[PDB]
Amino acid sequence: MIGLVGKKVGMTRIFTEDGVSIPVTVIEVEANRVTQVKDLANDGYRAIQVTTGAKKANRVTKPEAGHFAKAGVEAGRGLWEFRLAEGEEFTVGQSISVELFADVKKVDVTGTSKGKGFAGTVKRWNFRTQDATHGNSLSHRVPGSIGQNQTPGKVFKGKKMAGQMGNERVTVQSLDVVRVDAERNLLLVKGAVPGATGSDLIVKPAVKA
Amino acid sequence: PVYIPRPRPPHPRL
Amino acid sequence: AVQQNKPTRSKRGMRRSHDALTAVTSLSVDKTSGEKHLRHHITADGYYRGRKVIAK
């Protein structure tokens, strides 16, 4: 089915009576309000656009404000989109709560991983460090060779070099839903999800069974 | 100039 | 380490196509003294947002 848009509310653990400790990420999933329903006749595919949270009526622009007023919902902190799965139908202005996940066992969570900035090859690609001693000249964390010789005469595309690490769209799949608490608007999922505290997460039912 | 340094020895292609 | 051919005036100017300075888009007029100044900077006489703050 479709997913929800939550916010990463940090991590903690659930102690169970049988003794186990479960590391859970806490995702506050407020009501996702449908701002637009896309269909084959007009858009060519079936999806719902949702919003969540709240913005200020000075940071919401006139185009955004009109797009929200057409739906009848109040402005949220952005818009997301979920493809419909042939069996569900949503109306503009409908609220979807975390109760959508009441029966879900595993979810995929998509976040924007924490940004590491410009990373070297050791950190970014698990490149092996060269010698610390034994004669090494200024070449301890340097990448080593990047190509062969005259015969290729070039570096191949997709060479693992240094560059921007993190700050990108990551999906962690098949995380156990530990708890769905509808009154608190909370989803407790086992393990870590991408991103920092307070970042948007997209939680949808697991695509691999 | 007046002083030209000796060039560095080549790689010993021997 | 070093070039095999000298670059051209064309390549030189194309590289310098990003070296152009940006002028300050606008200057601020002081509430009280009416002097020009940078946003969020005191004026040359020591006013900021209409009040004498330095008296230099």
Partner: protein, 120 residues
């Protein structure tokens, strides 16, 4: 990679930074307004405003803390004698930064930092 970290290094080591901010705190308490660089002023807020918060309560242990942190008895007296009573009702924010152009010799962003009572 600097996530959630505070404190400007200011291209100094820790001992030099500590001594420089001790001196600058003394100078700001003495003159009630000083012209420095903008990053130095922003970093000096976190040095001088705790000193005034300390000086709000006048005990011997507080005098000795202020001395351990400023190393100037004239400064420790101006705090606890003038600035503490002056800012007794301020809930923080005893300093004000005013950006003032750029330095001639190196084009450094300049800022005045003053105490918000200096209206005389």
């Amino acid at each position: 990679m600097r996530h959630r970290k505070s404190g400007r290094q200011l291209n100094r080591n820790s001992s030099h930074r500590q001594a420089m901010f001790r001196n600058m705190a003394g100078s700001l308490v003495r003159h009630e307004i000083i012209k420095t660089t903008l990053p130095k002023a922003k970093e000096l807020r976190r040095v001088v405003e705790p000193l005034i918060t300390l000086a709000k309560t006048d005990s011997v242990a507080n005098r000795r803390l202020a001395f351990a942190r400023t190393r100037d008895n004239e400064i420790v007296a101006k705090l606890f004698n003038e600035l503490g009573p002056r800012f007794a009702s301020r809930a923080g924010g005893y300093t004000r930064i005013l950006k003032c152009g750029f330095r001639a010799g190196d084009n450094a962003p300049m800022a005045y930092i003053e105490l918000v009572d200096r209206s005389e």
